Amino acid sequence: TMVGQICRYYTQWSGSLKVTFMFTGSFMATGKMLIAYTPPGSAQPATREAAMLGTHIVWDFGLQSSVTLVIPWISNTHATGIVTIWYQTNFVVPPDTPTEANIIALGAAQKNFTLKLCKDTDEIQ
Amino acid sequence: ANIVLSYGEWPEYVSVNRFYTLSTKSWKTESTGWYWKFPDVLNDTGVFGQNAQFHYLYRSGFCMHVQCNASKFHQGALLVAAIPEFVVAASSGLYPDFAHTNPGKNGQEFRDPYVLDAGIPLSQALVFPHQWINLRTNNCATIIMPYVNALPFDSALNHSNFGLVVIPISPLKYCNGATTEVPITLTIAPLNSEF
Amino acid sequence: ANIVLSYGEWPEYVSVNRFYTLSTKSWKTESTGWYWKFPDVLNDTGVFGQNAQFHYLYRSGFCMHVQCNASKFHQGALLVAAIPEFVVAASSGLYPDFAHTNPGKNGQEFRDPYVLDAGIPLSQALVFPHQWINLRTNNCATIIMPYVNALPFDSALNHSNFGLVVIPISPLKYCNGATTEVPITLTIAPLNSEF
Amino acid sequence: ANIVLSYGEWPEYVSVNRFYTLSTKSWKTESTGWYWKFPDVLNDTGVFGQNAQFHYLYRSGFCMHVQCNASKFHQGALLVAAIPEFVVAASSGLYPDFAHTNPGKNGQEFRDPYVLDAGIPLSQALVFPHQWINLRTNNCATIIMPYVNALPFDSALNHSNFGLVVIPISPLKYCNGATTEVPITLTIAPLNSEF
Amino acid sequence: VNEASVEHFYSRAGLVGVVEVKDSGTSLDGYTVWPIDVMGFVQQRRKLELSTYMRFDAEFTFVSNLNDSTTPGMLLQYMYVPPGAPKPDSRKSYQWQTATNPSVFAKLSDPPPQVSVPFMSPATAYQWFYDGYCPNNMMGHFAIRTVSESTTGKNVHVRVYMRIKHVRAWVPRPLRSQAYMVKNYPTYSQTITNTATDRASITTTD
Amino acid sequence: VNEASVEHFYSRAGLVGVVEVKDSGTSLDGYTVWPIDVMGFVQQRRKLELSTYMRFDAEFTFVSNLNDSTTPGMLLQYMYVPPGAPKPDSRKSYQWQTATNPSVFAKLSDPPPQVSVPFMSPATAYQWFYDGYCPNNMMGHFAIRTVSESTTGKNVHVRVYMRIKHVRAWVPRPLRSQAYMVKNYPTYSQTITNTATDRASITTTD
């Protein structure tokens, strides 16, 4: 992505980010999903009953086709967050319809973002 | 949508006031129903569980929503009811055990739906603040519930104000190739809580 | 509908200004993509082909529309992009032949979609004036394109201003009994043309 | 009384803002002193310990009071000081262990008071916001302390903003029949805390 | 901010090539030519190919030295020839005396020479990608001579630094993930390499 | 008065270290690196530890000479690398040509080079004492190279002077009475020494 190739020409950065999900399945497919974000400096949740407590958003792709979440604020240099996808409800399908689908991730940055020091990149060609 | 306010009055008196999504239950062709005691369903989860078990006294209202997820090739119908002071009886030791009386957040499956497991015809369980779910009309239902009680400011670990009951009147049925279990989801949101 | 104007500016300066419907392309489960050089796609068809091959100099804008025709039991997703100065490279004689560089009105099928046949990640081909097509949302896409160039009034038989690219990200799939090829159609309409 | 405000400025931005009474320490004829790291003394006690260990960032001011309880037949004098960034050194493995660096709420007894256990003369430890206690004049001392820091909003389990130090300059002495240990008590009260 | 600018992104000096004029051993000549370029190094290629059309000026600096970091006082000549002109072909050819090939004179023991060159192009901008049908964007050459009658026997090493001013970029494009193979052409190898590092599983992390 | 000021207390130039690049005998290399510091000498340590938080700028001067106070005209290169960057590792490594490591060129027979460096820190001030849990306040490095192909056989001695400007000190603390033992740590010996000289009696004097 263009955020993670332009952040290799600098050393320090800080700000918020943006992630947008998109579902590509049949028209008559229904179900629910759960997306959560664990703040920096913690442990990855082991069950969905624990990820339900923090920051999250439910998503029913049978009624909506795209959902978005915003990370509050991150700042690294030169231990930094995690996001998980959980099942909540199975995937329902009528007869004579495929039983597979796919998702896209579509990451991006926000309006509060700064770069503070110049250096040469390392991922040569 | 078509929200129903029980008895026409709201309770009227951030961290502990948020949506709690409960476990999903599977609906099959053979099924009886489920029920949940509502002063306790949240006596083990979140901050609300902590301050309910610590403080002596409790009062609150509630808002409940039930969601379905099916297709246009399925058929069925459900009933959602709320019963103040839902006492569960035992058929013939004259003493139901702890599990049926105080189920966890997952609830307990009905044993004899016809008499509502309490010798109640279930043909008259519509005076209660009910709602209907038909698989061809809609897939949602919302209910408001004030704090009904004789003596104000009662316990939260020794009392049960009311209960919520879901029962399939018409049986689920489908054709070959379709998923054999529509899921059902329940959510709660404490409103105007005190301790 | 949801028309997108590339870079936010129109070109702004009967017989040769009309809709031209191109050949239909078939989409299968296995498929890579197609692309079309756009100063030449019409260098063999209609009056526009005649006055382009005769006159020395040329400038124009364009409007493109892509249409799909599927049912509610199919699944997939496409991407439509426009690339100014789309140079095609050759993998390892260091010289691609004439066919790939200057395809006819029917276009050329992509060989290696992952690197966009030019060593370009295709995970970043969204800075270009793109649009999406999802088989469950809609079936149309429109794009406006001004006349970008360094030197004004260049040739029409020795230059290529830009190119249009269609790529399936998610693969097509269906069930038994359904048609095994959704068609795709492309149309062009010269706007503010000069010679 | 004779309250002293350190550097002349207050921090200036119910449940977690209350008085915390620490353990009592005994004063004898032979004694060196005690000290307490102050961002951590309360990292194991009350609600403040819970929200400090959970949340990543922390900032706060503090108010401290020291009380004595003696009679008119005893003699002595103490010194109470507050040191921003009190780093403890080790005499001759070049690495003091965890216990001295991060003592509990009970604090750690001084090993070499003359050099303040850090090679500091202790004849100059009066530029710090100090106060005196004389057993014939009074028995109290109060200190206000703002939030001094280079970078705002730092950690609470990996940083130490300052430390408090109590040292007897003159030795305790008495006559026969009197109690052989005057007690000393310390209290804290978080003011203008944030998380 | 000011640091995250196109103006500051390209505003630095840096090496573009090294040139050595040899007058000892099997080769006894006094002149050397160098075709000026802007994309002789991979890193500057990937930084200059974030855009398609550009327009700027250039400033050139010359540092010259012997093979042992010694600086005697021998004289030297630097000449720039515009595009579309013959280049010298001998130690003392005729082209070394022309009034239209701007030349400069300086000694070996002196502050480094510094010169500036305007924007030389017959279009309104430079193009790195040209879809139509030995650098592509010709700018000129640099001929370096030691003013002497006979041979000297001492070699000279010369480096050159370029600064660019008043940059203007118009349309962007993604960066490059494949290895460079040839100059002036985007040809790539047949073993496609993934852009991202690999992972054991989609549900694992460290 | 003006002389009893923080501004005048710290406003002087002075040596911070000596660096010698050796290219003769058992060691034949052309480069030398030096981690810049501010507390390499005891006297500057005791003067910089009267405070806890500080903020300033720095100016650096370089004086270089042979081993017999002779100044030939060989060329030299000085390069500064910001914190968080690889450092050279050979006489002619790749890092000697990068556009982001500010470098300067000067001869051996010339007025001494002089450069300035801004306040480099990710906080609002420097800290000499840090109660939380190879200089601590990283600022950069200085790589010095003699531009040559082969060895030279002549060693070079280099001294460096630093001036600091726009000082700001916030909280004071007492001075040091014990002997210094280790760098970056306040560890002291086990034989405590009295701060004041001794006297025969409390009622005697000279």
- Whole-angstrom CA distances from B81 to B143, C138, F59, F154 are 9, 41, 81, 98
Round to whole Å and give the CA distance between B76 and E17: 80
Is F61:F13 a contact under the CB 8 Å cutoff? yes
DSSP assigned state of D114:
G
The first and second tokens of residue D127, run together, are: 């530029």
Residues in chain E whose Cβ is within 8 Å of chain C = 52-53, 123-125, 127, 129-133, 171-178, 181-182, 185-190, 192, 195
Question: Would an 8 Å CB–CB cutoff place A12 in contact with chain F?
Answer: yes
Radius of gyration of chain E (CA): 21
Q: Where do runs of H (alpha helix) occur along chain C?
A: 46-54, 98-101
B4-5 and B140-145 strand pairing: parallel
Burial zone of E103 (CB within 10 Å; 0-12 exposed, 13-18 middle, 19+ buried): middle
Q: Residue B181: its chain A contacts at CB < 8 A?
A: 90
The first and second tokens of residue D6, run together, are: 């350190």
CB atoms within 10 A of CB B61: 20
The first and second tokens of residue C64, run together, are: 């493109």
Question: Residue F149: what are its φ and ψ, rounded to 5°?
Answer: -85, -60
Residue reference for tokens 């032949």: C97
Residues C100, C106, C109, C110, Cα dihedral to 10°:
70
Round to whole Å and give the CA distance between E29 and E91: 6
Residues D27, D28, D32, D33, Cα dihedral to 10°:
0
Round to whole Å and give the CA distance between A55 and A38: 7
Amino acid at D102: N
Is C165:C141 a contact under the CB 8 Å cutoff? no
Residues D174, D177, D178: CA angle, nearest 5 degrees: 50
The first and second tokens of residue B156, run together, are: 């939260």
Is F158:F113 a contact under the CB 8 Å cutoff? no
Instruction: Report the chain A residue with the minimal C-alpha distance to residue D155.
Output: A41
- Cβ of B69 and A88 within 8 Å? no
Radius of gyration of chain F (CA): 21
- Cβ of E174 and C94 within 8 Å? no
Round to whole Å and give the CA distance between F12 and F162: 8
Amino acid at C23: S
Is E93:C49 a contact under the CB 8 Å cutoff? no
Q: Where do runs of H (alpha helix) occur along D95-155?
A: 98-101
F23-24 and D75-84 strand pairing: unpaired
Q: Which helix (H) or strand (E) holds E45?
A: helix E42-48
Q: Residue A32: its chain B contacts at CB < 8 A?
A: 69, 183, 185
Instruction: Report the chain C residue with the minimal C-alpha distance to residue A1.
Output: C124
**Cβ within 8 Å of residue E75, ≥6 positions away:** E105, E106, E107, E108, E146, E147
Nearest one of F179, F52, F41 to D87, comparing CA atoms: F52
**Cβ within 8 Å of residue E135, ≥6 positions away:** E35, E36, E37, E38, E39, E184
Instruction: Report the chain A residue with the minimal C-alpha distance to residue C74.
Output: A26
For an interface test with C, the pick among E55, E188, E192 (most C C-beta atoms closer than 10 Å) comes out as E188
Burial zone of C86 (CB within 10 Å; 0-12 exposed, 13-18 middle, 19+ buried): buried
Check residue E94 and give left, alpha or beta (phi > 0: left; psi -120 to 50: alpha): alpha
Question: Residue C187: what are its φ and ψ, rounded to 5°?
Answer: -135, 155
F31-35 and F141-145 strand pairing: antiparallel
- Whole-angstrom CA distances from F133 to B122, D87, D109, D158, F130 are 67, 11, 21, 6, 8
**Paired strand residues for A12:** A77
Question: Would an 8 Å CB–CB cutoff place A55 in contact with chain E?
Answer: no
User: Would you list the DSSP string of F22-57?
Assistant: -EETTEE-SEEEEE--S-SSHHHHHHHTSBSEE--E
DSSP assigned state of E202:
T
Whether chains F and C touch (3+ CB pairs under 8 A) is answered by no
Burial zone of E68 (CB within 10 Å; 0-12 exposed, 13-18 middle, 19+ buried): middle
Round to whole Å and give the CA distance between A5 and A9: 8
Round to whole Å and give the CA distance between C154 and C161: 10
For an interface test with C, the pick among E52, E127, E131, E184 (most C C-beta atoms closer than 10 Å) comes out as E131
Round to whole Å and give the CA distance between E76 and E64: 10
A102-104 and A66-69 strand pairing: unpaired
DSSP assigned state of C183:
E
The first and second tokens of residue E42, run together, are: 């991979």
User: Would you list the DSSP string of chain A?
Assistant: --HHHHSSSBSEEEEEEEEEEEEE--TT-B-EEEEEEEPSSS---SSHHHHTTSEEEEEETTT-SEEEE----EEEE----EEEEEE-S--B--SSS----EEE--EEEEEEEEE--B---S---
Residues B179, B183, B184: CA angle, nearest 5 degrees: 155
Amino acid at D36: W
Question: Would an 8 Å CB–CB cutoff place A60 in contact with chain B?
Answer: yes
The first and second tokens of residue D183, run together, are: 């007690």
Nearest one of E195, E189, E179 to A125, comparing CA atoms: E179
Nearest one of F152, F147, F27 to F79, comparing CA atoms: F147
Radius of gyration of chain B (CA): 17
- Cβ of A78 and F84 within 8 Å? yes
The first and second tokens of residue B107, run together, are: 């609830």
Round to whole Å and give the CA distance between E80 and E93: 15
Resolution (angstroms) equals 3.2
Residue reference for tokens 């249409």: C67
Amino acid at E101: N
C162-173 and C34-37 strand pairing: antiparallel
Residue E56 CA to chain centroid, in angstroms?
Answer: 15
- In terms of residues, how long is chain A? 125
Closest partner residue to D87 (CB to CB) among F174, F178, F186 is F186
Closest partner residue to C118 (CB to CB) among E171, E186, E192 is E186
Subunits next to C (3 or more Cβ pairs <8 Å) are A, E
Is E56:E168 a contact under the CB 8 Å cutoff? yes
For an interface test with F, the pick among D9, D36, D92, D126 (most F C-beta atoms closer than 10 Å) comes out as D92
- Cβ of F186 and D84 within 8 Å? no
Round to whole Å and give the CA distance between C85 and C94: 19
Number of alpha helices (DSSP H) and beta strands (DSSP E) in chain B: 2, 12
DSSP assigned state of E68:
T
Residue reference for tokens 């040769």: C16
Is B29:B105 a contact under the CB 8 Å cutoff? no
Subunits next to A (3 or more Cβ pairs <8 Å) are B, C, D, E, F
Q: Residue A40: its chain D contacts at CB < 8 A?
A: 56
DSSP assigned state of B50:
H
Question: Would an 8 Å CB–CB cutoff place F118 in contact with chain A?
Answer: no
Residue reference for tokens 């692309």: C35
D140-145 and D59-68 strand pairing: antiparallel
- In terms of residues, how long is chain D? 195
Burial zone of B100 (CB within 10 Å; 0-12 exposed, 13-18 middle, 19+ buried): middle
Radius of gyration of chain D (CA): 17
**Cβ within 8 Å of residue F25, ≥6 positions away:** none
Is E91:E127 a contact under the CB 8 Å cutoff? no
Buried b / exposed e over D33-64, threshold 16 CB at 10 Å, is: bbbbbbbbbbbeeeebbeebeeeeebbbbbbb
Residue reference for tokens 């519930």: B145
Is D135:D74 a contact under the CB 8 Å cutoff? yes
Q: Minimal Cα–Cα distance from A115 to chain E, Å?
A: 7
Half-sphere exposure of E120 (CA within 13 A, CB side): 17
**Cβ within 8 Å of residue A42, ≥6 positions away:** none
User: Would you list the DSSP string of E78-114?
Assistant: EEEE-SSS----STT-GGGS-TTS-EEEEESSSSPPE
**Paired strand residues for F64:** F158
CB atoms within 10 A of CB A125: 16
Residues D90, D92, D94, D99, Cα dihedral to 10°:
-40
Residue F98 CA to chain centroid, in angstroms?
Answer: 24
Is F21:F144 a contact under the CB 8 Å cutoff? yes
Amino acid at E87: K
Round to whole Å and give the CA distance between C36 and C17: 20
- Whole-angstrom CA distances from A37 to A48, A56, B46, F7 are 12, 6, 18, 50
Is B7:A38 a contact under the CB 8 Å cutoff? no
Nearest one of C42, C41, C82, C67 to C165, comparing CA atoms: C82
The first and second tokens of residue A4, run together, are: 């993670």
The first and second tokens of residue B14, run together, are: 């951030």
**Cβ within 8 Å of residue E97, ≥6 positions away:** none
Residue C160 CA to chain centroid, in angstroms?
Answer: 13
Is E85:E33 a contact under the CB 8 Å cutoff? no
Q: Is D20 helix (H, G, I), strand (E, B) or coil?
A: strand
Radius of gyration of chain C (CA): 17
B20-21 and B162-173 strand pairing: unpaired
Round to whole Å and give the CA distance between B185 and B176: 25
User: Would you list the DSSP string of D43-104?
Assistant: TTSHHHHHHHHHSS-BEEEEEEEEEE---TT-EEEEEEEEEET-PPP-B------HHHHS--
Amino acid at D156: A
How many pairs of residues across A and C have Cβ atoms under 8 Å apart? Answer: 42
- Whole-angstrom CA distances from C195 to C38, C49, C156, D85 are 16, 12, 10, 79
Torsional sign, CA A43, A44, A46, A51? positive
Subunits next to B (3 or more Cβ pairs <8 Å) are A
Q: Which helix (H) or strand (E) holds F106?
A: strand F103-107
Torsional sign, CA B46, B47, B53, B59? negative
Question: Would an 8 Å CB–CB cutoff place F182 in contact with chain A?
Answer: no
The first and second tokens of residue F128, run together, are: 């000499």
Round to whole Å and give the CA distance between B155 and E8: 69
Is E187:C90 a contact under the CB 8 Å cutoff? yes
Q: Minimal Cα–Cα distance from E56 to chain A, Å?
A: 22
Q: E strands along chain B, which residues?
A: 4-5, 20-21, 25-27, 34-37, 59-68, 75-84, 108-109, 131-134, 140-145, 162-173, 182-188, 191-194
- For this PDB entry, the determination method is cryo-EM
Buried b / exposed e over D104-126, threshold 16 CB at 10 Å, is: ebebbebebbbbbbbbbbbeebe
The first and second tokens of residue F38, run together, are: 């501010």
Residue reference for tokens 């160039």: C149
Amino acid at F12: R
Round to whole Å and give the CA distance between F42 and F58: 19
Question: Would an 8 Å CB–CB cutoff place E80 in contact with chain A?
Answer: no
Question: Residue B142: what are its φ and ψ, rounded to 5°?
Answer: -130, 145
The first and second tokens of residue C3, run together, are: 């028309």
Nearest one of F59, F43, F5, F13 to F168, comparing CA atoms: F5
User: Would you list the DSSP string of C20-89?
Assistant: EE---EEE-SS---EEEETTTTTTTSHHHHHHHHHSS-BEEEEEEEEEE---TT-EEEEEEEEEET-PPP
Round to whole Å and give the CA distance between A115 and A13: 5
